[PDB]
């Protein structure tokens with residue numbers, strides 16, 4: 384819903400993200416929130432504004448809750464649940480020696496649950512990666528920036544060969560045909576699991592995007608992380624089937640995760 388900035392306070396700078404500056408503040412006093420100022424010239428605003436009303440009705444504990452927007456000025460403000468520990472990618476790296484494999488699997492359950500709710504709403508992420516997941520003050524991980532890439536004007540961020548396209552998270556059918564589906568979000572989730580258990584290493588760090596694309600197309604798969612059991616690896620490996628329909632749904636995936644958690648007791 385629309386928000387009068389009168390009911391907001393700017394308290395701290397959190398840094399510039401993929402879609403503009405973000406600041407910490409309070410909404411209506413009692414809501415810790417993160418306010419993003421959409422970078423001007425980056426988004427198809429009318430399409431994006433109208434779609435924001437659709438994404439507002441998406442609610443889930445493991446989704447960064449959206450509280451409202453300020454759109455009758457530019458730059459647009461986006462008011463979101465405040466995730467105190469910031470991006471999951473950077474949270475993983477700074478606290479590398481503070482994670483037991485039980486906490487890592489938990490982080491995968493958090494994301495998978497959020498992605499299982501998005502699956503059931505027939506809503507695609509299109510850029511699932513650790514850089515788009517956030518962590519709150521209680522160590523819980525939540526997904527964000529889902530569907531945001533549909534309204535990016537830069538063709539580098541959108542085309543399969545664009546210099547900014549997330550090739551290292553993309554399934555073969557996204558690279559060759561641009562066929563986005565929940566199955567492509569599943570491939571991406573597999574890569575995300577590998578990010579988590581790797582404690583934030585760049586997937587295929589030493590491959591050019593092209594080198595990655597062709598190797599992926601011919602069967603290359605990320606190596607088993609050191610902290611991942613062969614059972615955890617089996618789960619993230621199933622996300623990487625060449626055939627999309629051969630990949631398990633987030634529902635089938637979440638169950639497998641819980642089976643592993645139970646066996647880690």
Ligand SMILES: Nc1ncnc2c1c(-c1ccc(C(=O)Nc3cc(C4CC4)ccn3)cc1)nn2[C@@H]1CCCN(C(=O)C2CC2)C1
Pocket residue numbers: 397398399400405416417418419431434435436438439447449461462463464465466467468469470473517527528529530531
């Ligand atoms: N909520 C936070 N809490 C703490 N930090 C946060 C955030 C955020 C944030 C802010 C807004 C959004 C959003 O609008 N999502 C959305 C909107 C829509 C709307 C169309 C309907 C649809 C789907 N997703 C998503 C993330 N960004 N940031 C830092 C930014 C700088 C880099 N960051 C770091 O941590 C590095 C310093 C280590 C994270």
